[PDB]
């Protein structure tokens, strides 16, 4: 599947959903952010973290 658009860390869409889930739930402080939720992810190496999406 190759429809234009350069191939990059598609995971970008995965971390984007997490950060949003923060406010959607009622998060606080403006500390939440893609790069922010991303660093914490590397600690899990997208391991069990990728399970949250399951099939």
């Amino acid at each position: 599947a190759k429809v234009q658009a350069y191939v990059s860390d598609e995971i970008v869409y995965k971390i984007n959903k997490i950060v949003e889930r923060r406010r959607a739930e009622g998060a606080k402080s403006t500390d939440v952010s893609f790069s922010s939720i991303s660093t914490m992810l590397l600690e899990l190496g997208l391991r069990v973290y990728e399970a949250q999406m399951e099939r």
Side-chain angles (χ1 to χ4, degrees):
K2 302 202 252 89
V3 186
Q4 298 215 349
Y6 186 92
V7 167
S8 225
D9 275 69
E10 168 53 61
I11 284 296
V12 62
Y13 190 44
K14 238 102 271 246
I15 305 189
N16 247 308
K17 291 150 57 181
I18 305 312
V19 188
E20 231 227 309
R21 184 199 153 179
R22 302 311 313 262
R23 269 104 68 151
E25 274 220 359
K28 281 220 106 273
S29 327
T30 190
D31 203 276
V32 166
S33 251
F34 183 76
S35 36
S36 283
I37 284 294
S38 172
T39 300
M40 56 160 248
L41 228 159
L42 199 96
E43 151 133 282
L44 262 122
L46 195 81
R47 196 91 259 170
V48 291
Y49 162 78
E50 221 242 314
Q52 283 220 129
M53 280 71 216
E54 278 238 21
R55 60 182 243 169

Short mmCIF file of all heavy atoms in Angstrom, two decimals:
data_model
loop_
_atom_site.label_atom_id
_atom_site.label_comp_id
_atom_site.label_asym_id
_atom_site.label_seq_id
_atom_site.Cartn_x
_atom_site.Cartn_y
_atom_site.Cartn_z
N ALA A 1 0.85 -1.22 0.00
CA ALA A 1 0.00 0.00 0.00
C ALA A 1 0.88 1.26 0.00
O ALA A 1 1.52 1.57 0.98
CB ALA A 1 -0.81 -0.09 1.29
N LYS A 2 0.90 1.97 -1.09
CA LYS A 2 1.74 3.21 -1.15
C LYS A 2 0.97 4.34 -1.83
O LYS A 2 0.99 4.47 -3.04
CB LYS A 2 2.97 2.81 -1.98
CG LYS A 2 3.68 1.64 -1.31
CD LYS A 2 5.14 1.60 -1.77
CE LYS A 2 5.35 0.42 -2.72
NZ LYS A 2 5.06 0.97 -4.07
N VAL A 3 0.30 5.15 -1.07
CA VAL A 3 -0.47 6.28 -1.67
C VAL A 3 0.21 7.61 -1.35
O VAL A 3 -0.18 8.31 -0.44
CB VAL A 3 -1.86 6.21 -1.02
CG1 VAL A 3 -2.78 7.23 -1.69
CG2 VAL A 3 -2.43 4.80 -1.20
N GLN A 4 1.21 7.97 -2.10
CA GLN A 4 1.92 9.26 -1.84
C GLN A 4 2.24 9.38 -0.35
O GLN A 4 2.23 8.41 0.38
CB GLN A 4 0.93 10.35 -2.26
CG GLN A 4 0.64 10.22 -3.76
CD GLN A 4 0.45 11.61 -4.37
OE1 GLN A 4 0.33 12.59 -3.65
NE2 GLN A 4 0.41 11.75 -5.66
N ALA A 5 2.53 10.57 0.11
CA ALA A 5 2.86 10.75 1.55
C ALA A 5 4.10 9.93 1.92
O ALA A 5 4.15 8.74 1.72
CB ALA A 5 1.63 10.23 2.31
N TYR A 6 5.10 10.57 2.46
CA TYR A 6 6.34 9.83 2.84
C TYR A 6 6.04 8.84 3.97
O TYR A 6 5.18 9.07 4.79
CB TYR A 6 7.32 10.90 3.31
CG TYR A 6 8.66 10.27 3.58
CD1 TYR A 6 9.63 10.22 2.58
CD2 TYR A 6 8.94 9.73 4.85
CE1 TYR A 6 10.88 9.64 2.83
CE2 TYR A 6 10.18 9.15 5.10
CZ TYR A 6 11.15 9.10 4.09
OH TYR A 6 12.38 8.52 4.34
N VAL A 7 6.74 7.74 4.02
CA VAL A 7 6.50 6.75 5.10
C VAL A 7 7.28 7.13 6.35
O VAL A 7 8.50 7.07 6.38
CB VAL A 7 7.00 5.42 4.53
CG1 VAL A 7 7.10 4.38 5.65
CG2 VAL A 7 6.02 4.92 3.46
N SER A 8 6.60 7.51 7.40
CA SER A 8 7.31 7.90 8.65
C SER A 8 6.82 7.05 9.83
O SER A 8 6.11 6.08 9.65
CB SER A 8 6.96 9.37 8.87
OG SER A 8 8.14 10.08 9.22
N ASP A 9 7.19 7.41 11.03
CA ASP A 9 6.74 6.64 12.22
C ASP A 9 5.21 6.62 12.30
O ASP A 9 4.62 7.35 13.07
CB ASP A 9 7.34 7.37 13.42
CG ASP A 9 8.78 6.89 13.64
OD1 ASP A 9 9.62 7.20 12.82
OD2 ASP A 9 9.01 6.22 14.64
N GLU A 10 4.57 5.80 11.52
CA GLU A 10 3.08 5.75 11.56
C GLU A 10 2.59 5.78 13.01
O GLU A 10 1.49 6.21 13.29
CB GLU A 10 2.72 4.42 10.89
CG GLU A 10 1.24 4.11 11.15
CD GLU A 10 0.39 5.30 10.72
OE1 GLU A 10 0.43 5.64 9.55
OE2 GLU A 10 -0.30 5.85 11.57
N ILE A 11 3.39 5.32 13.93
CA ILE A 11 2.97 5.32 15.36
C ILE A 11 2.49 6.72 15.76
O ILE A 11 1.76 6.88 16.71
CB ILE A 11 4.22 4.93 16.14
CG1 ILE A 11 4.47 3.43 16.00
CG2 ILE A 11 4.02 5.28 17.62
CD1 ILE A 11 3.31 2.66 16.63
N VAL A 12 2.89 7.72 15.03
CA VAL A 12 2.45 9.11 15.37
C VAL A 12 0.95 9.13 15.64
O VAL A 12 0.48 9.79 16.55
CB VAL A 12 2.80 9.95 14.14
CG1 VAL A 12 2.01 9.43 12.93
CG2 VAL A 12 2.42 11.41 14.40
N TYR A 13 0.18 8.42 14.85
CA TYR A 13 -1.29 8.40 15.07
C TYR A 13 -1.62 7.66 16.36
O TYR A 13 -2.61 7.93 17.01
CB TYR A 13 -1.86 7.65 13.86
CG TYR A 13 -3.36 7.79 13.84
CD1 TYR A 13 -3.95 9.03 14.09
CD2 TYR A 13 -4.16 6.67 13.58
CE1 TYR A 13 -5.35 9.16 14.08
CE2 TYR A 13 -5.56 6.80 13.56
CZ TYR A 13 -6.15 8.05 13.81
OH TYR A 13 -7.52 8.17 13.80
N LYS A 14 -0.80 6.72 16.75
CA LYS A 14 -1.07 5.96 18.00
C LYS A 14 -0.87 6.86 19.22
O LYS A 14 -1.72 6.95 20.08
CB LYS A 14 -0.04 4.83 18.00
CG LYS A 14 -0.76 3.48 18.08
CD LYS A 14 -0.79 2.84 16.69
CE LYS A 14 -2.04 3.30 15.94
NZ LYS A 14 -2.86 2.07 15.77
N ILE A 15 0.24 7.55 19.29
CA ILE A 15 0.48 8.45 20.45
C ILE A 15 -0.52 9.61 20.43
O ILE A 15 -0.94 10.10 21.46
CB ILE A 15 1.91 8.96 20.26
CG1 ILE A 15 2.86 7.77 20.13
CG2 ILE A 15 2.31 9.81 21.47
CD1 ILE A 15 4.31 8.27 20.15
N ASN A 16 -0.89 10.07 19.27
CA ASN A 16 -1.86 11.20 19.18
C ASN A 16 -3.17 10.82 19.88
O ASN A 16 -3.80 11.64 20.53
CB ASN A 16 -2.10 11.41 17.69
CG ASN A 16 -1.52 12.76 17.27
OD1 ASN A 16 -1.83 13.78 17.87
ND2 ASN A 16 -0.70 12.83 16.26
N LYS A 17 -3.59 9.59 19.76
CA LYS A 17 -4.86 9.16 20.41
C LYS A 17 -4.69 9.16 21.94
O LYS A 17 -5.59 9.50 22.67
CB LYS A 17 -5.12 7.75 19.90
CG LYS A 17 -5.49 7.80 18.42
CD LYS A 17 -5.04 6.51 17.73
CE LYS A 17 -5.67 5.31 18.44
NZ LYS A 17 -5.15 4.12 17.71
N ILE A 18 -3.53 8.78 22.41
CA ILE A 18 -3.31 8.75 23.88
C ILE A 18 -3.39 10.17 24.45
O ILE A 18 -4.20 10.45 25.31
CB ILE A 18 -1.89 8.19 24.05
CG1 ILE A 18 -1.79 6.84 23.34
CG2 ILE A 18 -1.60 8.00 25.54
CD1 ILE A 18 -2.98 5.96 23.73
N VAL A 19 -2.57 11.06 23.98
CA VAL A 19 -2.61 12.46 24.49
C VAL A 19 -4.06 12.96 24.53
O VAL A 19 -4.54 13.42 25.55
CB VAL A 19 -1.79 13.28 23.49
CG1 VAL A 19 -1.60 14.70 24.03
CG2 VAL A 19 -0.42 12.62 23.30
N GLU A 20 -4.76 12.87 23.44
CA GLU A 20 -6.17 13.34 23.42
C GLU A 20 -6.96 12.67 24.55
O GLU A 20 -7.69 13.31 25.28
CB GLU A 20 -6.71 12.91 22.05
CG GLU A 20 -7.36 14.11 21.36
CD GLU A 20 -8.73 13.71 20.81
OE1 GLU A 20 -8.80 12.70 20.12
OE2 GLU A 20 -9.69 14.41 21.08
N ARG A 21 -6.82 11.38 24.69
CA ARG A 21 -7.56 10.67 25.77
C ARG A 21 -7.35 11.38 27.11
O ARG A 21 -8.18 11.32 28.00
CB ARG A 21 -6.95 9.26 25.81
CG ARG A 21 -7.71 8.40 26.83
CD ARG A 21 -6.85 7.20 27.23
NE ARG A 21 -7.31 6.84 28.60
CZ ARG A 21 -6.77 5.82 29.22
NH1 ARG A 21 -6.61 4.69 28.59
NH2 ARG A 21 -6.40 5.94 30.46
N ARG A 22 -6.24 12.06 27.26
CA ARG A 22 -5.98 12.78 28.54
C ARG A 22 -7.06 13.84 28.78
O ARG A 22 -7.75 13.82 29.78
CB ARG A 22 -4.61 13.44 28.35
CG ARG A 22 -3.57 12.36 28.04
CD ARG A 22 -3.69 11.22 29.06
NE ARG A 22 -3.75 11.90 30.39
CZ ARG A 22 -2.68 12.01 31.12
NH1 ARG A 22 -1.62 12.60 30.64
NH2 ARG A 22 -2.66 11.53 32.33
N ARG A 23 -7.22 14.75 27.87
CA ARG A 23 -8.25 15.81 28.05
C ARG A 23 -9.65 15.20 27.94
O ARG A 23 -10.50 15.43 28.76
CB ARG A 23 -8.01 16.81 26.91
CG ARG A 23 -7.04 17.89 27.38
CD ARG A 23 -5.65 17.63 26.78
NE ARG A 23 -5.82 17.88 25.32
CZ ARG A 23 -4.81 18.30 24.61
NH1 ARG A 23 -4.21 19.41 24.94
NH2 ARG A 23 -4.41 17.62 23.57
N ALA A 24 -9.88 14.40 26.92
CA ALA A 24 -11.23 13.77 26.78
C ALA A 24 -11.69 13.25 28.14
O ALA A 24 -12.86 13.28 28.46
CB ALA A 24 -11.02 12.62 25.80
N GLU A 25 -10.78 12.78 28.94
CA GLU A 25 -11.15 12.27 30.28
C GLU A 25 -11.27 13.43 31.27
O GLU A 25 -12.01 13.36 32.24
CB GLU A 25 -10.01 11.33 30.68
CG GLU A 25 -10.27 9.94 30.10
CD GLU A 25 -9.86 8.88 31.13
OE1 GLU A 25 -9.40 9.26 32.19
OE2 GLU A 25 -10.03 7.71 30.84
N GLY A 26 -10.54 14.49 31.05
CA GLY A 26 -10.60 15.65 31.98
C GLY A 26 -9.21 15.94 32.54
O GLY A 26 -9.06 16.46 33.63
N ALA A 27 -8.18 15.60 31.80
CA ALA A 27 -6.80 15.86 32.30
C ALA A 27 -6.67 17.31 32.76
O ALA A 27 -7.57 18.11 32.59
CB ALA A 27 -5.89 15.59 31.10
N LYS A 28 -5.56 17.66 33.35
CA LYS A 28 -5.37 19.06 33.82
C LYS A 28 -3.96 19.55 33.48
O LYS A 28 -3.12 18.80 33.04
CB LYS A 28 -5.57 19.00 35.33
CG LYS A 28 -7.07 18.94 35.65
CD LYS A 28 -7.37 19.82 36.86
CE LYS A 28 -8.09 21.10 36.40
NZ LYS A 28 -7.00 22.05 36.05
N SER A 29 -3.69 20.81 33.70
CA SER A 29 -2.34 21.35 33.39
C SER A 29 -2.04 21.22 31.90
O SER A 29 -2.47 20.29 31.24
CB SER A 29 -1.38 20.48 34.21
OG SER A 29 -2.02 20.08 35.41
N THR A 30 -1.30 22.15 31.35
CA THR A 30 -0.97 22.09 29.90
C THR A 30 0.31 21.29 29.68
O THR A 30 1.08 21.55 28.77
CB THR A 30 -0.78 23.54 29.47
OG1 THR A 30 -0.70 23.61 28.05
CG2 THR A 30 0.51 24.09 30.08
N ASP A 31 0.56 20.31 30.51
CA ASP A 31 1.80 19.49 30.35
C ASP A 31 1.57 18.38 29.33
O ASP A 31 2.50 17.86 28.74
CB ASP A 31 2.07 18.90 31.73
CG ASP A 31 3.55 18.54 31.86
OD1 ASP A 31 3.91 17.46 31.42
OD2 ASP A 31 4.29 19.36 32.38
N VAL A 32 0.34 18.00 29.11
CA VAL A 32 0.05 16.92 28.13
C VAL A 32 0.42 17.38 26.71
O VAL A 32 0.18 18.51 26.33
CB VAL A 32 -1.46 16.68 28.23
CG1 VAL A 32 -1.93 15.85 27.04
CG2 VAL A 32 -1.76 15.93 29.53
N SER A 33 1.00 16.51 25.93
CA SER A 33 1.38 16.89 24.54
C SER A 33 1.94 15.67 23.80
O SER A 33 2.50 14.77 24.39
CB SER A 33 2.46 17.96 24.71
OG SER A 33 1.93 19.22 24.34
N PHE A 34 1.80 15.64 22.50
CA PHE A 34 2.32 14.48 21.72
C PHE A 34 3.72 14.10 22.21
O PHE A 34 3.92 13.03 22.76
CB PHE A 34 2.38 14.98 20.28
CG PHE A 34 2.82 13.85 19.38
CD1 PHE A 34 1.92 12.84 19.03
CD2 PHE A 34 4.13 13.82 18.89
CE1 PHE A 34 2.33 11.79 18.19
CE2 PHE A 34 4.55 12.77 18.05
CZ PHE A 34 3.65 11.76 17.71
N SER A 35 4.68 14.95 22.02
CA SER A 35 6.06 14.63 22.48
C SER A 35 6.05 14.16 23.93
O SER A 35 6.75 13.24 24.30
CB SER A 35 6.84 15.94 22.35
OG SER A 35 5.98 17.03 22.68
N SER A 36 5.25 14.78 24.76
CA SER A 36 5.19 14.36 26.19
C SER A 36 4.68 12.92 26.30
O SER A 36 5.34 12.06 26.85
CB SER A 36 4.20 15.32 26.84
OG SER A 36 4.83 16.58 27.05
N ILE A 37 3.52 12.64 25.79
CA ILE A 37 2.97 11.26 25.87
C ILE A 37 3.88 10.28 25.11
O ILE A 37 3.84 9.09 25.33
CB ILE A 37 1.59 11.34 25.21
CG1 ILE A 37 0.61 12.01 26.18
CG2 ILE A 37 1.10 9.93 24.89
CD1 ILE A 37 0.41 11.12 27.40
N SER A 38 4.69 10.78 24.21
CA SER A 38 5.59 9.88 23.45
C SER A 38 6.74 9.40 24.34
O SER A 38 7.00 8.22 24.46
CB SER A 38 6.13 10.73 22.30
OG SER A 38 7.14 10.01 21.61
N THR A 39 7.44 10.31 24.97
CA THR A 39 8.57 9.91 25.85
C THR A 39 8.12 8.80 26.81
O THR A 39 8.76 7.77 26.92
CB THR A 39 8.93 11.18 26.63
OG1 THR A 39 9.30 12.20 25.72
CG2 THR A 39 10.09 10.89 27.58
N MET A 40 7.04 9.00 27.50
CA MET A 40 6.55 7.96 28.45
C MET A 40 6.32 6.64 27.71
O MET A 40 6.44 5.57 28.27
CB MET A 40 5.24 8.51 29.00
CG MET A 40 4.29 8.83 27.85
SD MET A 40 2.59 8.92 28.47
CE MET A 40 1.97 7.44 27.63
N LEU A 41 5.97 6.71 26.45
CA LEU A 41 5.73 5.45 25.68
C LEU A 41 7.04 4.69 25.48
O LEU A 41 7.10 3.49 25.66
CB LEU A 41 5.18 5.92 24.33
CG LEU A 41 3.92 5.11 23.99
CD1 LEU A 41 3.09 5.88 22.96
CD2 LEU A 41 4.33 3.76 23.41
N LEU A 42 8.09 5.37 25.09
CA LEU A 42 9.38 4.67 24.86
C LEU A 42 9.77 3.84 26.09
O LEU A 42 10.45 2.84 25.98
CB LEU A 42 10.41 5.78 24.63
CG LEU A 42 11.63 5.19 23.93
CD1 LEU A 42 11.50 5.41 22.42
CD2 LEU A 42 12.89 5.89 24.44
N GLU A 43 9.32 4.23 27.25
CA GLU A 43 9.64 3.45 28.46
C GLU A 43 9.02 2.06 28.31
O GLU A 43 9.53 1.07 28.80
CB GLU A 43 9.00 4.25 29.59
CG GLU A 43 8.60 3.33 30.74
CD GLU A 43 9.06 3.93 32.07
OE1 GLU A 43 10.24 3.83 32.37
OE2 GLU A 43 8.22 4.48 32.76
N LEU A 44 7.92 2.00 27.62
CA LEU A 44 7.24 0.70 27.41
C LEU A 44 7.63 0.13 26.04
O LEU A 44 7.18 -0.93 25.65
CB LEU A 44 5.75 1.03 27.44
CG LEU A 44 5.18 0.73 28.82
CD1 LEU A 44 4.56 2.00 29.41
CD2 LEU A 44 4.11 -0.36 28.71
N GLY A 45 8.47 0.82 25.31
CA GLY A 45 8.88 0.32 23.97
C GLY A 45 7.65 -0.11 23.18
O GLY A 45 7.64 -1.13 22.52
N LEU A 46 6.60 0.67 23.24
CA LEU A 46 5.36 0.30 22.48
C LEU A 46 5.01 -1.17 22.72
O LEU A 46 4.33 -1.79 21.93
CB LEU A 46 5.71 0.54 21.01
CG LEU A 46 4.42 0.55 20.18
CD1 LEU A 46 3.76 1.92 20.30
CD2 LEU A 46 4.76 0.27 18.72
N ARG A 47 5.47 -1.73 23.81
CA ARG A 47 5.16 -3.16 24.09
C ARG A 47 3.71 -3.31 24.56
O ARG A 47 2.79 -2.96 23.85
CB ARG A 47 6.15 -3.56 25.19
CG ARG A 47 6.22 -5.09 25.29
CD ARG A 47 7.32 -5.61 24.36
NE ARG A 47 6.60 -6.12 23.16
CZ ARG A 47 7.27 -6.46 22.09
NH1 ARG A 47 8.31 -5.76 21.73
NH2 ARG A 47 6.90 -7.49 21.39
N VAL A 48 3.49 -3.83 25.74
CA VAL A 48 2.09 -3.99 26.24
C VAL A 48 1.26 -2.76 25.88
O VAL A 48 0.06 -2.83 25.70
CB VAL A 48 2.22 -4.12 27.76
CG1 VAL A 48 2.89 -5.46 28.10
CG2 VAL A 48 3.07 -2.98 28.30
N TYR A 49 1.89 -1.62 25.75
CA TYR A 49 1.14 -0.39 25.39
C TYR A 49 0.37 -0.61 24.08
O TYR A 49 -0.74 -0.16 23.93
CB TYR A 49 2.21 0.69 25.21
CG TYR A 49 1.64 1.85 24.43
CD1 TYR A 49 0.81 2.78 25.07
CD2 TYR A 49 1.95 2.00 23.07
CE1 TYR A 49 0.28 3.86 24.34
CE2 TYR A 49 1.42 3.08 22.35
CZ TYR A 49 0.59 4.01 22.98
OH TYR A 49 0.07 5.07 22.27
N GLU A 50 0.96 -1.30 23.15
CA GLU A 50 0.27 -1.55 21.86
C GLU A 50 -0.93 -2.47 22.07
O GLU A 50 -1.78 -2.61 21.20
CB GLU A 50 1.33 -2.22 21.00
CG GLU A 50 1.25 -1.67 19.58
CD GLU A 50 0.90 -2.80 18.61
OE1 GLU A 50 1.50 -3.86 18.72
OE2 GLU A 50 0.04 -2.59 17.77
N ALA A 51 -1.02 -3.10 23.20
CA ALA A 51 -2.17 -4.01 23.46
C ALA A 51 -3.45 -3.20 23.68
O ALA A 51 -4.54 -3.63 23.34
CB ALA A 51 -1.80 -4.78 24.74
N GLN A 52 -3.33 -2.03 24.25
CA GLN A 52 -4.54 -1.19 24.49
C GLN A 52 -5.43 -1.17 23.24
O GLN A 52 -6.64 -1.09 23.33
CB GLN A 52 -4.00 0.21 24.78
CG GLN A 52 -3.46 0.26 26.21
CD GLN A 52 -3.83 1.60 26.85
OE1 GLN A 52 -4.38 1.65 27.93
NE2 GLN A 52 -3.55 2.71 26.21
N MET A 53 -4.83 -1.24 22.08
CA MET A 53 -5.64 -1.22 20.83
C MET A 53 -6.15 -2.63 20.50
O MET A 53 -7.15 -2.80 19.84
CB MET A 53 -4.68 -0.74 19.74
CG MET A 53 -4.56 0.79 19.82
SD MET A 53 -3.62 1.24 21.30
CE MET A 53 -4.55 2.74 21.70
N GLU A 54 -5.46 -3.64 20.96
CA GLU A 54 -5.90 -5.04 20.67
C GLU A 54 -6.29 -5.18 19.20
O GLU A 54 -6.06 -4.29 18.40
CB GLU A 54 -7.11 -5.26 21.57
CG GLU A 54 -6.64 -5.61 22.98
CD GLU A 54 -7.21 -6.98 23.38
OE1 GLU A 54 -7.56 -7.73 22.49
OE2 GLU A 54 -7.29 -7.24 24.57
N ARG A 55 -6.87 -6.28 18.83
CA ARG A 55 -7.27 -6.48 17.41
C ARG A 55 -8.24 -5.37 16.97
O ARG A 55 -8.64 -4.60 17.83
CB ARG A 55 -7.97 -7.84 17.37
CG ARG A 55 -9.19 -7.81 18.30
CD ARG A 55 -9.85 -9.19 18.31
NE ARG A 55 -11.22 -8.96 17.75
CZ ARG A 55 -11.97 -9.98 17.42
NH1 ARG A 55 -11.63 -10.73 16.41
NH2 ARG A 55 -13.05 -10.24 18.10
#
